[PDB]
Amino acid sequence: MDTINITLPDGKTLTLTVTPEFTVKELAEEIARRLGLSPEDIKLTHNGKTLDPSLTLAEYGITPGSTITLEIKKKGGLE
Numbered sequence: 001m002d003t004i005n006i007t008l009p010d011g012k013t014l015t016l017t018v019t020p021e022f023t024v025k026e027l028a029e030e031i032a033r034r035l036g037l038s039p040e041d042i043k044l045t046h047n048g049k050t051l052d053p054s055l056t057l058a059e060y061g062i063t064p065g066s067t068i069t070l071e072i073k074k075k076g077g078l079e
Contacts, residue, residue, distance in 0.1 A: 001063070001064040001065030002017055002018070002064050003015050003016065003017055003018075003064060003065070004016055004017075004018050004064050004065065004066060004068060005066075005067055005068065006031060006068050006069075006070060007067070007068070007069045007070070008035070008070055009070075009071075009072070014031060014034070016030065016031055017064075018057060018062070018064050019057075020056075020057065020058040022057055023053070023055075023056055023057065024044065024051045024052065024053050024054075024055060024056065024057060025039060025053035025054075027057065028042060028044065028053065037072070039053065041072050041073060042070050042071070042072055043070065043071050043072075043073075044068060044070055045068075045069055045070070045071060046060070046062065046066070046068055
C-alpha cells in the first residue's frame with residue numbers, strides 16, 4: 001500500500017500518496033492546496049491523538065492504507 005484516505009467534514013474522501021521523507025507539515029500543505037485552506041487551521045487526528053507539524057510521519061508510526069480524519073476550527077464572534 002502507498003495511498004491513504006482522508007475523511008473531511010464534507011463527508012467525501014481524498015486519495016494521496018505518503019512517504020517516510022514527507023513531514024506532517026508538508027503532507028498537510030499538499031492536501032490543503034486542493035481544498036483551498038491553510039495548514040495552521042487543519043489538524044490531523046489518529047487514534048485520538050493529534051499530530052504535530054514539527055515532527056515526522058515515520059516518528060508516529062503511520063502506514064499507508066489507514067483511515068485518517070481531519071478537523072478545522074471556525075470562529076464566529078465574541079459571544
